[PDB]
Amino acid sequence: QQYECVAEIGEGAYGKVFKARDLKNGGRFVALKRVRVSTIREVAVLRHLETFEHPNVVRLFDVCTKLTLVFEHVDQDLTTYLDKVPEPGVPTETIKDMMFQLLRGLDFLHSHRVVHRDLKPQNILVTSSGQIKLADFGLAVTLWYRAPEVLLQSSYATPVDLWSVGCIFAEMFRRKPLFRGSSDVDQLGKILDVIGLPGEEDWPRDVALPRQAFHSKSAQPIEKFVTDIDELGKDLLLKCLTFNPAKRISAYSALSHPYFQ
Numbered sequence: 396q397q398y399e400c401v402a403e404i405g406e407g408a409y410g411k412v413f414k415a416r417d418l419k420n421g422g423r424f425v426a427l428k429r430v431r432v433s434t435i436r437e438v439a440v441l442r443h444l445e446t447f448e449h450p451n452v453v454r455l456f457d458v459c460t461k462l463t464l465v466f467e468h469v470d471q472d473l474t475t476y477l478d479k480v481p482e483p484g485v486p487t488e489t490i491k492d493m494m495f496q497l498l499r500g501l502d503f504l505h506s507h508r509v510v511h512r513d514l515k516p517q518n519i520l521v522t523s524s525g526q527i528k529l530a531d532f533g534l535a536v537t538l539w540y541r542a543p544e545v546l547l548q549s550s551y552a553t554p555v556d557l558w559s560v561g562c563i564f565a566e567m568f569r570r571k572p573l574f575r576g577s578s579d580v581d582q583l584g585k586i587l588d589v590i591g592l593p594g595e596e597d598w599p600r601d602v603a604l605p606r607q608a609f610h611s612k613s614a615q616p617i618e619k620f621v622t623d624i625d626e627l628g629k630d631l632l633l634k635c636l637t638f639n640p641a642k643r644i645s646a647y648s649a650l651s652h653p654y655f656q
């Protein structure tokens with residue numbers, strides 16, 4: 396066979412992913428994923444996205460006839476990069492650059508009508524040369540990066556990923572997740588303890604959870620939780636971690652933010 400499986404990547408409720416030797420292409424490493432039996436549509440969206448070969452999205456090499464997906468392989472995810480970084484942590488300009496690359500791939504995906512929906516450091520790939528690549532999106536548990544509207548079961552638009560990006564931004568400074576909740580209700584609580592209770596006008600209509608189920612008074616200063624963050628990074632982090640997804644910054648606006656002057 397064209398590929399020899401060597402290891403399992405992780406273990407996800409999306410199916411098994413293998414690290415494999417690409418016997419025909421110089422024995423390079425590839426990430427192999429099998430699909431079972433709108434799905435045809437998703438694969439076409441993925442192949443179409445690959446035509447652009449955006450630098451900040453994982454390369455798709457092949458699609459084999461039930462259906463097997465061949466991607467490039469990258470050694471580390473953001474998790475293992477933040478776990479191995481020497482003290483006191485990640486250089487200020489390394490965080491800036493990585494965040495710019497994250498928003499570049501995100502704006503590319505959003506402008507092509509793709510919502511990641513499950514952005515976390517575990518699916519952000521960090522290349523040998525320091526390139527950030529978005530992976531594991533566009534195909535049909537940790538709530539630590541889950542947006543408030545997903546938690547509330549109301550909307551699932553592109554702002555969902557900007558909340559996730561804000562959580563990752565903070566975690567790049569802290570090297571620990573900003574909101575380590577254990578359930579959707581807990582997660583939403585841990586969030587409102589930091590950002591404060593939103594205006595009744597910012598609370599989604601016809602959701603199970605009312606605003607009155609929480610009493611997380613005022614917004615605590617974010618510098619308490621994210622120590623070492625500059626004033627400009629604080630503006631971008633607040634704009635990402637905005638309650639109302641309509642009021643949330645977009646990936647396109649974030650790319651222009653003074654933080655990246």
Ligand SMILES: CN(C)C(=O)c1cc2cnc(Nc3ccc(N4CCNCC4)cn3)nc2n1C1CCCC1
Nearest residue numbers: 404405412426428453466467468469472518530531
């Ligand atoms: C397969 N699909 C659809 C993809 O988009 C895809 C293309 C990929 C290319 N290289 C990796 N590398 C990689 C990523 C995470 C981890 N870790 C796992 C957690 N513990 C630490 C080590 C280890 N190696 N993963 C890829 N993925 C996915 C991203 C999430 C897993 C599979």
